[PDB]
Structure formats: structure tokens, C-alpha cells
Write a protein that binds this ligand. Structure first.
Ligand SMILES: NC(=O)c1ccc[n+]([C@@H]2O[C@H](COP(=O)([O-])OP(=O)(O)OC[C@H]3O[C@@H](n4cnc5c(N)ncnc54)[C@H](OP(=O)(O)O)[C@@H]3O)[C@@H](O)[C@H]2O)c1
Ligand SMILES: CCc1nc(N)nc(N)c1OCCCOc1ccccc1CCC(=O)NS(=O)(=O)C(C)C
Length: 167
């Protein structure tokens, strides 16, 4: 369904291990180049919102992510995010008709109450939760959606896509 341009659709998009781990040591603890393709089709041409630590985790070669208005949340007024914009709270981050929150753990939790879509790649990797891990947000019972089929990446890693939505 098309988004009426006067509304404010907020989506979250992330990839997680079975356990819910999404981040560890300032990085994503797997590599799934196939997952980048879905990430691009979902986010291209819209505003993307990320926490400062996720900005730090982006490779300099793709930073800011092209074709998208990059917004970084930080409480550091002097933060340097070249080619992006830095806002100090959530309200000014979510002003676009369509916004995709692209991480990390803190900012997913912050934005979830306002979101009506989650695009979730589940990676079949057994990484138990560890102290300091960044984690996927917990979805309450208002969400619903579709579970995709498992597929192998070129590397042999198995993954599948969940598309969740709510009113
Ligand atoms: N698997 C995935 O799909 C995926 C996607 C993205 C990221 N990641 C990984 O997730 C990890 C990063 O997640 P994280 O939870 O540690 O950090 P994060 O959510 O990316 O960023 C946290 C930072 O955002 C700022 N912030 C948080 N709440 C704010 C608020 N209400 N107002 C203003 N600023 C706020 C603060 O920046 P300041 O400290 O500068 O004040 C805070 O330190 C990394 O490991 C990353 O590689 C994984
Ligand atoms: C792709 C990981 C990911 N997957 C999902 N499903 N949701 C996320 N929020 C997520 O993290 C998005 C932020 C982390 O992004 C990373 C991390 C490592 C290497 C490169 C990057 C840039 C991403 C990139 O290359 N994007 S792209 O549009 O293909 C164009 C910039 C090449």
C-alpha cells in the first residue's frame, strides 16, 4: 500500500541472529551480502535514522549511505557526521513521510512505539546473548506478518526474512 504523503510512516529494519543479537564490539558479527540487497530496496529514496554508534560502524566508503537522507541521533552537539544531519532527540528525526530506522539497539527501542513496519532478516547463527550485546527490540502482540523461507547465502549461511506490520 502506498503511503499518503501527509502521514508519517516509520519502519524498522534489522538483521538478527536466532538469539536476537544484532551487534557486538561495534560491528555486526556475521556477513550476509545478500541481506544488503533487501536493505537497499527497502530504504532507498527515504529518510534513514540511526544512532551515533551505528554511524560510527558504517564503512567510510558508504558513509553517508547514498540515495537516502541520513539522520544521526546523538546528544553530542559537536558531532561530525559529514554528509548527514545530527539531531539531539527523536521528534525531529521522524518528520518525513517515510522513515526507516536502521539501528542500533538503542534507537530501535526508541523508535519502535511509532513504527508500523519491521523488516527482519533472521540469520541462522548460534550466537548466545553476551554482556554488552546490542539486541533486537521485542515485538508485542500488536504485530503480525509473514515468515519467509530459509535460503543459503553463497557462503553457506542460512537466512530468512520476516515482514511485520501493524496498524
Ligand atoms: N544487525 C543490524 O541490523 C544492525 C544495524 C545497525 C547497527 N547494528 C550494530 O548495533 C550496534 C550499535 O547499536 P547500539 O545500541 O550500541 O547504539 P546505537 O543505537 O546505534 O546508537 C546509540 C547512540 O545513539 C544516541 N542516542 C540514543 N538515544 C538517543 C536519544 N533519545 N536522543 C539522542 N541521542 C540518542 C546516543 O549517541 P551519543 O553517545 O553520541 O550521545 C547513543 O550513544 C553496533 O554493533 C552495530 O554494528 C546492527
Ligand atoms: C546491511 C546490514 C543491515 N541489514 C539490515 N537488514 N538492516 C540493517 N539496519 C542493517 O544495518 C545497516 C547499517 C549497518 O550497515 C553496514 C554494516 C556493515 C557493512 C556495511 C554497511 C552499510 C550498509 C550498506 O551497504 N547499504 S547499501 O544501501 O547496500 C549501500 C550503502 C551499498
Amino acid at each position: 500500500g502506498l503511503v499518503p504523503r501527509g502521514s508519517h510512516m516509520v519502519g524498522l529494519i534489522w538483521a538478527q541472529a536466532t538469539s536476537g543479537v544484532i551487534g557486538r564490539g561495534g560491528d555486526i558479527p556475521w556477513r550476509l551480502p545478500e541481506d544488503q540487497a533487501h536493505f537497499r530496496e527497502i530504504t532507498m529514496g527515504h529518510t534513514i535514522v540511526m544512532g551515533r554508534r551505528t554511524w560510527d560502524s558504517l564503512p567510510a566508503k558508504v558513509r553517508p549511505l547514498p540515495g537516502r537522507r541520513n539522520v544521526v541521533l546523538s546528544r553530542q552537539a559537536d558531532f561530525m557526521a559529514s554528509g548527514a544531519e545530527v539531531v539531539g532527540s527523536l521528534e525531529e528525526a521522524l518528520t518525513s513521510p517515510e522513515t526507516w530506522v536502521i539501528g542500533g539497539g538503542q534507537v530501535y527501542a526508541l523508535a519502535l512505539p511509532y513504527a508500523t513496519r519491521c523488516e527482519v532478516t533472521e540469520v541462522d547463527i548460534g550466537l548466545p546473548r553476551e554482556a554488552g550485546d546490542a539486541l533486537a527490540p521485542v515485538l508485542d502482540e500488536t504485530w503480525r506478518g509473514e515468515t519467509g523461507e530459509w535460503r543459503f547465502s553463497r557462503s553457506g549461511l542460512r537466512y530468512r526474512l520476516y515482514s511485520y506490520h501493524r496498524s
